[PDB]
């Protein structure tokens, strides 16, 4: 129950249960090609009434950093704001855009602030942080514990194990940003309980030009198994 308490085995139980809230959110894919990084996720609604052009699971932090998550969107909107502030603090001091690793460190610090006090629960989200700094792509994975991992490809959320084996068997380097989007959508198609439309998913890419959330037209283009 309590968070400032170890078990005799030496485990933190509320953190393990906060990860269970990440393991039940919508899937999210991440692939790091040679000249870019892809972020894709399932954005599916419970009715035809929900306007999908109003909320976004893929969000920018800067011109060259972007996010997705698996789990709780209320928790996501806090870390989006915090990351956007920390990037601006870094810019205000150094007048250089923040590297993708320092943001992950400073954001895992925020996630760790919520693991040590009583009267606060941890975040029920994991993040995937894409970037393009120093002529190289980056992809990280921040957890509620305050721990981050650099990946070449991974998947979070529902069926995050088979979706990762699929990448282990269907991913290599010597790719580019267009061969990776096809692989990410194919990795999302495993868990898609229905017809995949341009409005049921959400895609964002980063490259030399910076981060951009693709449009439904571009999604419908590659949804035809095209490129």
């Amino acid at each position: 129950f309590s968070l400032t308490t170890f078990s005799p085995s030496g485990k933190l139980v509320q953190i393990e249960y906060a990860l269970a809230a990440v393991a039940g959110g919508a899937p999210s894919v991440g692939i790091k090609a040679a000249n870019g990084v892809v972020l894709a996720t399932e954005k599916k609604q419970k009715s035809i009434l929900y306007d999908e052009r109003s909320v976004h699971k893929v969000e920018p932090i800067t011109k060259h950093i972007g996010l997705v998550y698996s789990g709780m969107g209320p928790d996501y909107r806090v870390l989006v704001h915090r990351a956007r502030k920390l990037a601006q603090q870094y810019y205000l001091v150094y007048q250089e855009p923040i590297p993708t690793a320092q943001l992950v460190q400073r954001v895992a610090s925020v996630m760790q602030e919520y693991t040590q006090s009583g009267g606060v629960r941890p975040f029920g989200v994991s993040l995937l942080i894409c970037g393009w700094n120093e002529g190289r792509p980056y992809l990280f994975q921040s957890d509620p514990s305050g721990a981050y991992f650099a990946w070449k490809a991974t998947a979070m959320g529902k069926n995050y194990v088979n979706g990762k084996t699929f990448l282990e068997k269907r991913y290599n380097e010597d790719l580019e940003l267009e061969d990776a989007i096809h692989t990410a959508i194919l990795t999302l198609k495993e868990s898609f309980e229905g017809q995949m439309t341009e409005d049921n998913i959400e895609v964002g890419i980063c490259n030399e030009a910076g981060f951009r959330r693709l449009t439904p037209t571009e999604v419908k283009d590659y949804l035809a198994a095209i490129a």
Partner: protein, 207 residues
């Protein structure tokens, strides 16, 4: 080696062996249960539609012994089939610990349901050895009526009701065993993933 012994155990009794029992239960055992039940009704009607005399104490109808022996066989088969599932679950209860026992509770719940199916239903209303019970309770009156003979009329009807109430007991115990088997099927098929691997370690927040 120790892990070698644990491996020799956990390879002999696997999830496939426990699911082969569930398939057979869902397919044939329930129909056999219902068949014994209709047979018990078919027999109970005959006794309800009959008069008994001193001649009926000189012989026991094989129609009742057949149903009792069918229920005997069914009880034996279900007991062994359930002990197989018990043996599959009990060789995987892991190291004892204060905590991390969310799957251990599942194992104990399913083992409790199986223990119910065994003891509360098979006798190991009426259970496995109903045939011994019937023959003893009847062999009492058959001697009291022959010698010399007892002039008690209610005894002659009590013989008839010994013959009838055991068929009724079979008809009810089969109806109850069907429910118990149908409950164990759901329990297994819903919870089987944490009966095999109850504990799952997350060492992501360690370095």
């Amino acid at each position: 080696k120790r892990a070698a012994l644990i491996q020799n155990l956990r390879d002999s009794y696997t999830e496939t062996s426990s699911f082969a029992v569930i398939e057979e239960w869902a397919a044939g055992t329930l129909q056999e249960i219902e068949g014994i039940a209709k047979a018990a009704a078919e027999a109970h009607g005959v006794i309800r539609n009959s008069t008994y005399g001193r001649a009926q104490a000189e012989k026991s109808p094989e129609q009742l012994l057949g149903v009792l022996q069918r229920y005997q066989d069914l009880c034996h088969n279900v007991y062994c089939q359930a002990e197989t599932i018990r043996t599959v679950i009990a060789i995987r209860i892991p190291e004892h610990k204060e905590a991390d026992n969310l799957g251990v509770a599942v194992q104990h719940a399913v083992l409790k349901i199986i223990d119910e199916l065994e003891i509360k239903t098979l006798g190991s209303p009426i259970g496995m050895y109903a045939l011994r019970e019937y023959l003893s309770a009847r062999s009492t009156v058959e001697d009291k009526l022959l010698g010399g003979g007892s002039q008690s009329p209610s005894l002659l009807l009590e013989l008839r009701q010994i013959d009838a109430d055991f068929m009724l007991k079979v008809e009810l115990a089969t109806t109850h065993l069907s429910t118990m088997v149908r409950a164990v099927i759901n329990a297994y098929l819903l919870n089987w993933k944490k009966l095999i691997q109850p504990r799952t370690g997350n060492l992501s927040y360690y370095t």
